């Protein structure tokens, strides 16, 4: 059934599963036309598909061409996401196909379910959790490769960099969501925090800085502090 705080640790057992986040699939800018009406301009998007156990990210870039000559785009986005997720599953060897796919938004249950009819033994699941994967386009290197693409493309990353070499999946995922949560609530400050010190750099094959163990602790504390500050500001508490 639905994923919530109760069944949180299922994510890190040895059953393969993916998250699918579709919040950046269809991205527009809103502007005024010469006659003064409002019009949309789409930009490149991405399907954010993530194995929370291993960090492997399947970033499926969605090129604006896809939308050309189409109606009910926000509705089509959900169906293209499922088409693309389905194709990814089918590209993967049997022993790598997920046993469950968890959608971060309930609108994706019916499109995915339909597209996965050929995989009756893969369970499509909602979640109650409030995950911050929408903030993935606040990670500089992911936004860079989305925005530069000239055609549909799939780009693989590991969203944990090399953390698993020293910490567990649970811890890695908590760190990822804490960093994404911070990015979502106040990007400028979250990015300040990660990058203030110019002597801690990002490996070319990495997304985040090469913090030492001790420095991650300062960072996670600073991210925490940021998030609680912004909460008090939002609600006058």
């Amino acid at each position: 059934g639905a994923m919530n705080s109760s069944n949180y640790a299922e994510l890190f057992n040895n059953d393969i599963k993916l998250f699918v986040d579709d919040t950046n699939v269809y991205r527009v800018t809103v502007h005024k036309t010469f006659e003064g009406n409002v019009a949309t301009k789409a930009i490149n998007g991405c399907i954010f598909t993530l194995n929370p156990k291993t960090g492997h990210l399947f970033l499926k870039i969605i090129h604006t061409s896809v939308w050309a000559g189409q109606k009910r785009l926000s509705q089509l986005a959900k169906w293209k996401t499922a088409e693309e997720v389905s194709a990814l599953v089918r590209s993967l060897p049997k022993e790598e196909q997920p046993k469950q796919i968890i959608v971060t938004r309930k609108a994706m249950l019916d499109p995915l379910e339909v597209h996965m009819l050929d995989f009756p033994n893969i369970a499509i699941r909602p979640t109650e959790l409030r995950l911050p994967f929408s903030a993935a386009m606040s990670i500089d290197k992911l936004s860079d490769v989305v925005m530069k693409a000239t055609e549909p493309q799939m780009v693989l990353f590991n969203i944990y960099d090399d953390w698993l070499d020293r910490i567990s999946s649970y811890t890695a995922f908590s760190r990822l969501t804490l960093l994404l949560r911070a990015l979502k609530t106040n990007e400028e400050s979250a990015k300040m925090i990660l990058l203030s010190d110019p002597t801690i750099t990002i490996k070319s094959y990495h997304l985040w800085p090469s913090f030492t163990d001790e420095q991650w602790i300062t960072i996670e504390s600073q991210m925490r502090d940021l998030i609680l500050t912004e909460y008090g500001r939002k609600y006058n508490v």
Binding site: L76, W79, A82, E83, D110, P111, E113, V114, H115, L117, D118
Partner: protein, 300 residues
């Protein structure tokens, strides 16, 4: 005009015949129902005074034999049975009328209700859904499950309705996933109408049979099937115009005939708002829409 005699009425029961019904008292002298119109299917149904649970009954067609009712004390229910001896049967019927112990199928001549509920129901199709081919009539009751319910246990007692499933390979053509799931015309028109049902009248008959089983026995799987069939049409953008006009009459008389107090379990809120207000066919059920608004505005 046909007759259905009863050997006896040992136990207190409410008898139904189509949309009519009577209370009959323990060992009251009751010997059957007369003046039943030949030319339509019928259903004689029962509810014991002692067990308000379990409504049960027999679907039948008088052109297919001479049928009567006899109470079985081992099994504890009124059973339908067929008399093969013509003379012996006219003999029993003639004598019971003479003694005037029979109620009259009470049809008002203006009333087309029963015809309107059963227009497309044919006895041969009922006997494929309720398979028991040593008998010319068909037994149904409240607790009987459908085949689709058995998938998600005894198949002898199954309602073998036609299985409809919107999230299935049958319904969805590969490569047309989105198109076929928002617009089910493919599923209705090629797979179901041309493929399985062959014509709209069989489709409508099963639809109508399903509704009556839900109404007369609270058969939950039969309600489910009726709503599925309705949903399939309303969610199809391209429907033959004659089907749309017939469905409006069909539904109208079904809503008209439903007990007022049962509207909460018998009517699926989601399907009806979709049919009446969201679907492709929102503007095509004017009679059904008007009766629903004036009789059950709350459900919407």
């Amino acid at each position: 005009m046909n007759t259905v005699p009863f050997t006896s009425a040992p136990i207190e029961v409410t008898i139904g015949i189509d949309q009519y019904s009577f209370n009959v008292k323990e060992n009251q002298p009751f010997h059957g129902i007369k003046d039943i119109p030949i030319g339509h299917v019928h259903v004689i149904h029962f509810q014991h005074a002692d067990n308000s649970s379990m409504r049960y009954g027999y679907w039948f067609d008088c052109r297919m034999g001479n049928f009567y009712i006899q109470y079985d004390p081992k099994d504890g229910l009124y059973k339908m049975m067929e008399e093969r001896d013509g003379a012996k049967f006219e003999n029993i019927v003639h004598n019971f009328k003479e003694r005037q112990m029979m109620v009259s199928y009470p049809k008002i001549d203006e009333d087309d209700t029963w015809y309107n509920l059963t227009e497309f129901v044919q006895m041969d199709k009922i006997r494929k859904i309720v398979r028991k081919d040593e008998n010319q009539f068909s037994y149904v009751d409240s607790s009987m499950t459908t085949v689709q319910e058995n998938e998600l246990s005894d198949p002898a007692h199954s309602l073998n309705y036609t299985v409809i499933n919107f999230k299935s390979r049958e319904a969805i053509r590969p490569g047309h996933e989105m198109e076929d799931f928002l617009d089910k015309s493919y599923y209705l028109n090629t797979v179901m109408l041309q493929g399985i049902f062959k014509n709209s009248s069989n489709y409508f008959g099963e639809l109508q049979f399903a509704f009556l089983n839900a109404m007369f026995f609270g058969n939950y799987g039969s309600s489910l099937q009726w709503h599925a069939m309705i949903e399939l049409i309303c969610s199809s953008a391209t429907v033959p115009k004659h089907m749309l006009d017939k469905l409006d009459e069909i539904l109208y008389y079904q809503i008209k005939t439903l007990p007022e107090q049962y509207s909460d379990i018998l009517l699926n809120e989601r399907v009806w708002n979709i049919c009446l207000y969201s679907s492709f066919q929102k503007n095509s059920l004017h009679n059904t829409e008007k009766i629903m608004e004036n009789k059950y505005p709350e459900l919407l």
